[PDB]
Subunit: 106 residues, 2 copies
């Protein structure tokens, strides 16, 4: 009754437990200092078998706005990876539509 | 560098290409259906960059040019790919 309001604005909030594989099954790109330059952090790819796909609220090309309650504003690529790698229990992510990458089924 | 032979939907989503919103970036497999044709081959992986499709280089292809080629094609579809290797993205 609060996620629903933000989704209408539309920021999407997702809760994820990591697998028995200790993985979210997503690849993130961007961030300050990333191999792409200082660009926002987004989801580049999603593993077929993995946890994030089962959310069905996470999409390739979503920008990551917050991770485990922390804004990604000014966050480096390496910090975002460290945060998600070390996180455990329920992992909160909030995202918005980006077109940093758009994907098409074929 | 791997060569794959698909018989044909391919059950993959592709991203990148020339004039993509990042800039001109190689086309890659962004997602896959684990039960689809690409997955059934066991030589394609999310994160592969597509070097050639149907015997032609992907280099200078727009995202639109790549998608229309793969949707339009049928029979034997060749692809050659190289692993992204977590160079411009990181698995988590």
């Amino acid at each position: 009754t609060e996620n629903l309001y933000f989704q209408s604005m539309g920021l999407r909030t997702v809760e994820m437990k990591k697998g028995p594989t200790d993985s979210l099954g997503i690849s993130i790109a961007g961030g300050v200092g990333s191999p792409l330059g200082d660009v926002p952090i987004f989801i580049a790819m999603m593993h077929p078998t993995g946890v994030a796909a089962q959310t069905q609220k996470l999409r390739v090309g979503d920008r990551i706005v917050t991770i485990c309650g922390t804004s990604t504003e000014g966050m480096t690529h390496t910090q975002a990876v460290n945060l998600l790698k070390n996180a455990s229990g329920s992992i909160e992510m909030q995202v918005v539509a980006g077109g940093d990458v758009s994907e098409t089924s074929v």
